[PDB]
Amino acid sequence: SPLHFVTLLGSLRKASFNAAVARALPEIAPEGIAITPLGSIGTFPHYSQDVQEEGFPAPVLTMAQQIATADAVVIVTPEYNYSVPGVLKNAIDWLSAVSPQPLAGKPVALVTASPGMIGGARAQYHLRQSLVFLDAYVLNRPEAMIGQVTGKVDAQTLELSDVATREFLARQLDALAALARTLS
Amino acid sequence: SPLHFVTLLGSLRKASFNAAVARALPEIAPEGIAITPLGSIGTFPHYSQDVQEEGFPAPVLTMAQQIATADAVVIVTPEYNYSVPGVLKNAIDWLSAVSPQPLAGKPVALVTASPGMIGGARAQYHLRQSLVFLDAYVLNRPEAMIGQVTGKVDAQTLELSDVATREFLARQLDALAALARTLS
Amino acid sequence: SPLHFVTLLGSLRKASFNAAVARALPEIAPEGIAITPLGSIGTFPHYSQDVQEEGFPAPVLTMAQQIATADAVVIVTPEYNYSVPGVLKNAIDWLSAVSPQPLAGKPVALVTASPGMIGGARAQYHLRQSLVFLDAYVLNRPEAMIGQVTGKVDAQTLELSDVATREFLARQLDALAALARTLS
Amino acid sequence: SPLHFVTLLGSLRKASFNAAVARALPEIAPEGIAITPLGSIGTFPHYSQDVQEEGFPAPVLTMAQQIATADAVVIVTPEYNYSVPGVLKNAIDWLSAVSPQPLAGKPVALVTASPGMIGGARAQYHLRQSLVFLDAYVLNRPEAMIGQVTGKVDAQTLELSDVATREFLARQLDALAALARTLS
Ligand SMILES: Cc1cc2nc3c(=O)[nH]c(=O)nc-3n(C[C@H](O)[C@H](O)[C@H](O)COP(=O)(O)O)c2cc1C
Ligand SMILES: Cc1cc2nc3c(=O)[nH]c(=O)nc-3n(C[C@H](O)[C@H](O)[C@H](O)COP(=O)(O)O)c2cc1C
Ligand SMILES: Cc1cc2nc3c(=O)[nH]c(=O)nc-3n(C[C@H](O)[C@H](O)[C@H](O)COP(=O)(O)O)c2cc1C
Ligand SMILES: Cc1cc2nc3c(=O)[nH]c(=O)nc-3n(C[C@H](O)[C@H](O)[C@H](O)COP(=O)(O)O)c2cc1C
């Protein structure tokens, strides 16, 4: 039976390593899994309750409905200052205020890429804490931290070339698929 | 000898309880301490490395220089989804990329206000982790979590009326003043 | 279909409020749920790989199987120094080293109690980070933080008296029960 | 002016890599710094308020005064289950209950070692949260995470061999020394 995962990207720069990792997921997705990207978090305005009462920003509603109708979400993000990038958290913040709230009961897998060796590990646990509050089911195993990403995605092609990393993510995706089927 | 603290506000809505708490600090500041607000984090664009290379946004540079020349910073913010509001973290993110980086060696005190009983405690530790990376010296004691804030700031005047809360913050400010003098 | 939960207690003192809360769970468990206590974490020696090479202590293996054969685990602990009590973390440390590891795939609900306003919340999230590594499924909703436990447990009888708190714990158990059934 | 640091060790096994790292510190300490070990955390019984009412165990009071009279403390610990080892947290628990509490105002540097890529980083931040409550000053920079410690300690002699790692630890000590002098 087919499944549909959507990806939420936490960096906005064109040469983003995390963007490259994210773009490789539809190509990597195992059989019975289709993966499409969500809109950019950059079209979102800063969360404000004054702006929310004037009406929810359109791209917020679009992402929410895309998340709600998907079987799982894969969040692919860098780590900024030992935590999650504000831009990404601002998106999570908009989604949390949406009714009904899209991440409740939603299987989610985390992927972080970094040039350093920690591979964005610190952000993941900060992100998990937020996701607890929204009642998402976040994949425990396996965890995907991609350190030393520069030697794993080639520049000017901005493609995830590393076969080992590619295989690793493909098995994470399978583990997320087992999770969404366990809760269905 | 006089001291100068600047305040960074984490909510953007007019009726923000945290804004009310922040506005009460110059009035509450003990003798030998002057407190001024910083610019809004809402004028900041989302952090992007592509935008940074085109030049630092003006209000980012203004806030950085205001932070660098101050004796301490007081961050007054709500808690969003068990963490720090993305908008605020986006600001921290911009400041981290500034050279020289304004929060290094900077005494900082945290204040959180919330209608619930936890009083924004969860955000504070997430924020502390980010501040470690930027080498800020964050006040350990006393901690300021204002739960049940609705009964402590009156509506339509948006003023921190609570005398007990006011006194508490005034002694926190004194504790931050002792910290900035210990490291000078 | 009946279910069997086990409780893990994080405090060692006779007059523990968290213990009173734990003792109340068998009595509060809804229809179709039986809840039994685990052994004291106080019989465990400090974790050491040297003590492990010579063999797992009997009470560690006992707790491991009781956890394994149970449908869910309920952890009831105070908060020590903004984190989890070392003695309780020590028990978690012992269990994690057991093969096969008992908490893998194990539905878990957390309950924390404190005389303070925070109600042991800081401990719950630190504990959640450890439980991710052990691939346990920790109940996201509802969360049980019991603040001001002092006026919620009758003294000299050490019984959980607050009915509102009591019915609350029963709603969590039903949710934990729902989680265990979703993962079977 | 001379300074005296004490080391707190988080592992109990004879062949501990973190122990080897701790043993190297007196030898690596720059001019004007003397570093002595504290007693084993393994002599401490599990924390209990009942065991405390009958009196603080002698080795807890011993560690407390050694910490008190020392200019700084260096904590060297592995990471257990994405957090701090229970046995080490247990020692922290005992110390926090001592009056006067030894870590108040105490300059502290953290060092963690792991065979893995993460180098015990997750433990450091959990530990930082506890240390905020105890009003210790934890060195922000530089941070010492020793990953792949296996190829950095000579086997059969259990000595810290990596010179790059060794000089690194000496740069932290100088920074810890600078912090202790800024707060005198
Ligand atoms: C403001 C800022 C904060 C950062 N913080 C961290 C960090 O805390 N830990 C880390 O390993 N890398 C950190 N980095 C580096 C990023 O991991 C690296 O720039 C990465 O390539 C950015 O992600 P991207 O390529 O998808 O844009 C930070 C970078 C920036 C610009
Ligand atoms: C998106 C969002 C997330 C929130 N998350 C939390 C939370 O995690 N914990 C909490 O106590 N309150 C939370 N709140 C409630 C705020 O604490 C409350 O709205 C507060 O008044 C907002 O701060 P302000 O008054 O300064 O704007 C959240 C509110 C919003 C809109
Ligand atoms: C070593 C120690 C650390 C503590 N740390 C905290 C804490 O971080 N936060 C808190 O709210 N209470 C803290 N407490 C207070 C406990 O919540 C209180 O002792 C509680 O009654 C203990 O739980 P119990 O009754 O089940 O033994 C601490 C107590 C001790 C002895
Ligand atoms: C119970 C237990 C939990 C562990 N948890 C982690 C962990 O979370 N992260 C990690 O990188 N290593 C973990 N390890 C592996 C240790 O880093 C490894 O055993 C290390 O050599 C122990 O430090 P030591 O040599 O000083 O005793 C764990 C080991 C044990 C026994």
From TrEMBL, chains A, B, C, D:
GO molecular function terms attached to this record: FMN binding; oxidoreductase activity
GO annotation, cellular component aspect? cytosol
The NADPH-dependent FMN reductase-like domain covers: 6-149
- How is this protein named in the record? Chromate reductase
- The residues listed in the UniProt record as binding FMN, with positions renumbered to this chain, are S11, R13, S16, F17, N18, E79, N81, Y82, S114
| UniProt keyword terms in alphabetical order | Flavoprotein, FMN, Nucleotide-binding
Q: Which domain of life is it from?
A: Bacteria
